[PDB]
Design a protein around this ligand. Structure first.
Ligand SMILES: Nc1nc2c(ncn2[C@@H]2O[C@H](COP(=O)(O)OP(=O)(O)O)[C@@H](O)[C@H]2O)c(=O)[nH]1
Ligand SMILES: Nc1nc2c(ncn2[C@@H]2O[C@H](COP(=O)(O)OP(=O)(O)O)[C@@H](O)[C@H]2O)c(=O)[nH]1
Ligand SMILES: O=P(O)(O)OC[C@H]1O[C@@H](n2cnc3c(SP(=O)(O)O)[nH+]cnc32)[C@H](O)[C@@H]1O
Ligand SMILES: O=P(O)(O)OC[C@H]1O[C@@H](n2cnc3c(SP(=O)(O)O)[nH+]cnc32)[C@H](O)[C@@H]1O
Ligand SMILES: O=CN(O)CC(=O)O
Ligand SMILES: O=CN(O)CC(=O)O
Ligand SMILES: [Mg+2]
Ligand SMILES: [Mg+2]
Lengths: 431, 431
């Protein structure tokens, strides 16, 4: 299809960035529809490595236009930081980045609150990235946040600015008894760049509508994973955005009947960063491997990630909320050399019931345990293999199993970090 | 199609309730995906009148199952209130209402904050309905709200309850210097009904998924209108939810590729309740008519509604975000007896530019003016007319004009409040 969507089918870090860059060979626009600079994506091309956080994975192709939709919570500081360090690598970011004047702004106070809150909860911290994404979003729904559009008028703006920090300060000090953020500084830094931001501004909803009257290729790029959806995720250990497929229409402005193909990224094993429910979590040696070998460390916080076995019940969930058309299996290579592999196929509830449908909220996952299925692994290696043919029988056997259990095809197999080290059995666009 | 969606294409009150009830003759489930008991719907059947607010318009047919999705912000008080007064009219609400354990709860403190905030803003009040929808939503995105699922465990719950009111109280008193809500009371009332609420609980995302493997008919029922979308609406004068078509997938759990037909309700003239931008607003006599004749008064607040001419530029917007498959024109009859009608066809900007695309934020609509087009009306009357044939040439002429200007068909024409007083040129289901 024409409107393709890429998103994490799990707890994020399945491999989205990679895929979005490999697929943009043939697309015209790439749209980020939610999240902030909490997303941590890693693209590798001939060894050269790039980790974007707020800027879309399409920034390096000069045929694609990267748009930052209204779903995203834009931090003026982060953009600048990112933009500059890329322009220094020969990438003309400004010649190709556009954004929504409706994006809410993340400013220091958000960070202050985000971090102050985490402390308030102590024994129950969510383990957020500390980027102030939560508060940035709250203010949005509380109808008091500042958007990209309000940087235009600067007199009008400082009044507003003065109004929200006042209230935020009041709580920062009196309530958490933390330090206050100075209005004068926040005001300056923002003002320092208002014009740069304001020049990238575009009417996204409408352009995307244009793109379509033409059948232009548009790739939607997800942030975080499915079990982090604020509504459908393991609340309260989630992100503040609808990371699931509906986030696209709300976050970009494109009508829902225009989503043509939704591809879900699947990591082959499981990771979770931050706190929260995780049934198939590996605390033993096998954990250490998957983590060692799969170089599992946060892409934004450098925090080590929890690893565990692939959970087929959670994934059956994401197929469902997401109306996935197809999967893209990543990191199979990270499994070479194990004696055998295992996958969660059903859940044993705290009262004895064997279920195949996930709970849906932190506390309700509390006592559940995984009923795995055991498979012979492979000592042969698969890293860098570019064709179904080079993959050993135990692998293909593992691959078709997943399809069986989910009923969803495996269109792309990923065997390493470099763009080129992939295997496309079916391209989402011409499907 | 099988999954039909009904939503307001304007600022709400276009007529959704009616239509949802008329259409549910042939559907199995009806899902509410956002909003609260701020929505005010009015269904009339053989004169008998019913105004639902939180409970779906499908409550009166005994072949439909009404589901309250996770998008909705459920007030235990409102449900009870509503449920009881309907059961008294012979409708077995409990035999047919189901809901999501993921719905966040609206409790007195929300109302307190909502109303305290409105006061804080004074000269700039949003004119919300005072139902505490905003705060109920904030807490949700702030990851501290209480959901239907947490009423299950009652020990666990009171801790949590104790935790959020503490903080909310702190601001209520210290900050706004308003009165504090008593934890003991809130706790009791909720506890009074936890079991009733908890018995209606269902796994919505999954059932809807079942409904579909079968091709069951499912009607999605919108709340508020399109220019109230928190992202895409005239911020900050909007509701806190994505009232636009993406609200469906995020609010119910159904995958976006399953939306088959999106029908938009169109009122024939314009109303807005609450404060905010409104270009074609009629302050003159013609305003009084449309308001008098069209019995324009809030369905939830009894507040008089602003009326003005139909705005084709705003509507061209909703076609776009909504990927509307078709329209349902309501209240044409309310136009009988005018010398001539007019419709906004383009916007004249504050700097002289004639545009046909809406601004998108309160302040940015500030100076714009409507470039209307003028049409002969009709002295003949259309109220209660059940067939295209009975509609006079000036009407049909008005009708085809709208289609021209929007490029979207007019599938249902509504000529009055009673269910039966409609004209279906194309049923959304078998389309
Ligand atoms: N070994 C291996 N690493 C991969 C593969 N695909 C991607 N990666 C790399 O693994 C990491 C996935 O983490 P991350 O970039 O945070 O994913 P994101 O959440 O989608 O942005 C990055 O190193 C990728 O370049 C693969 O198939 N094999
Ligand atoms: N005269 C007239 N009134 C109508 C028509 N369709 C609906 N109504 C009535 O007009 C009102 C629309 O307001 P409301 O119920 O708040 O709409 P909602 O926002 O969709 O729930 C209610 O009286 C309806 O029963 C129509 O075609 N003609
Ligand atoms: O509120 P935030 O800062 O988003 O964090 C809340 C939770 O979101 C989780 N979180 C946020 N972003 C991510 C990503 S980024 P990417 O998948 O887009 O590359 N990955 C994993 N956890 C995340 C975080 O670990 C914490 O558990
Ligand atoms: O935060 P709320 O209470 O929703 O109100 C904010 C704005 O939402 C507007 N508002 C909320 N609900 C409605 C409806 S209800 P229905 O269309 O679902 O029947 N109609 C009109 N304005 C509304 C309200 O008038 C105020 O302008
Ligand atoms: O790639 C995303 N990261 O895991 C986020 C983080 O490390 O905080
Ligand atoms: O029908 C909905 N109403 O207009 C809401 C209200 O009156 O507040
Ligand atoms: Mg990542
Ligand atoms: Mg109404």
């Amino acid at each position: 299809g024409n409107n393709v969507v890429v998103l994490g089918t799990q707890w994020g870090d399945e491999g989205k960035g990679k895929i979005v860059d490999l697929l943009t060979e043939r697309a015209k626009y790439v749209v980020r529809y939610q999240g902030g600079h909490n997303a941590g994506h890693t693209l590798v091309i001939n060894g050269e490595k790039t980790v974007l956080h707020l800027i879309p994975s399409g920034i390096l192709r000069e045929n694609v236009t990267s748009i930052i939709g209204n779903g995203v919570v834009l931090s003026p500081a982060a953009l600048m930081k990112e933009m500059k360090e890329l322009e220094d690598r020969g990438i003309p970011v400004r010649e190709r980045l556009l954004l929504s004047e409706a994006c809410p702004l993340i400013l220091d106070y958000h960070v202050a609150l985000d971090n102050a809150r985490e402390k308030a909860r102590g024994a129950k911290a969510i383990g957020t990235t500390g980027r102030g994404i939560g508060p940035a979003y709250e203010d949005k729904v509380a109808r008091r946040g500042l958007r990209v559009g309000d940087l235009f008028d600067k007199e009008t703006f400082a009044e507003k600015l003065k109004e929200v920090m006042e209230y935020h300060n009041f709580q920062l000090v009196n309530y958490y008894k933390a330090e206050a953020v100075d209005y004068q500084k926040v005001l300056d830094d923002t003002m320092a760049v208002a014009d740069i931001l304001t020049s990238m501004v575009v009417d996204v909803s409408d352009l995307l509508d244009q793109a379509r009257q033409r059948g232009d290729f548009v790739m939607f790029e997800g942030a975080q994973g499915t079990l982090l959806d604020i509504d459908h995720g393991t609340y309260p250990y989630v992100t503040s955005s609808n990371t699931t497929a509906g986030g696209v229409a709300t976050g970009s402005g494109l009508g829902p009947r225009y989503v043509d193909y939704v591809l879900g990224i699947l990591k082959a094993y499981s990771t979770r960063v931050g706190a929260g429910p995780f049934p198939t979590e590996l605390f033993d040696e096998t954990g250490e491997f998957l983590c060692k070998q799969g170089n599992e460390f946060g892409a934004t916080t450098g925090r080590r990630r929890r690893t565990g076995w692939l959970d087929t019940v959670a994934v059956r969930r994401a197929v469902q909320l997401n109306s996935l058309s197809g999967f893209c299996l990543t990191k199979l290579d990270v499994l070479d050399g194990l004696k055998e592999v295992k996958l969660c196929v059903a859940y044993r509830m705290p009262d004895g019931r064997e279920v195949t449908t996930t709970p849906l909220a932190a506390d309700d996952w509390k006592g559940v345990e995984p009923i795995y299925e055991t498979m012979p692994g492979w000592s042969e290696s698969t890293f860098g293999v570019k064709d179904r043919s080079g993959l050993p029988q135990a692998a293909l056997n593992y691959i078709k199993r997943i399809e069986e259990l989910t009923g969803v095809p495996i269109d792309i197999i990923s065997t390493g970090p470099d763009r080129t080290e992939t295997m496309i059995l079916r391209d989402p666009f011409d499907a």
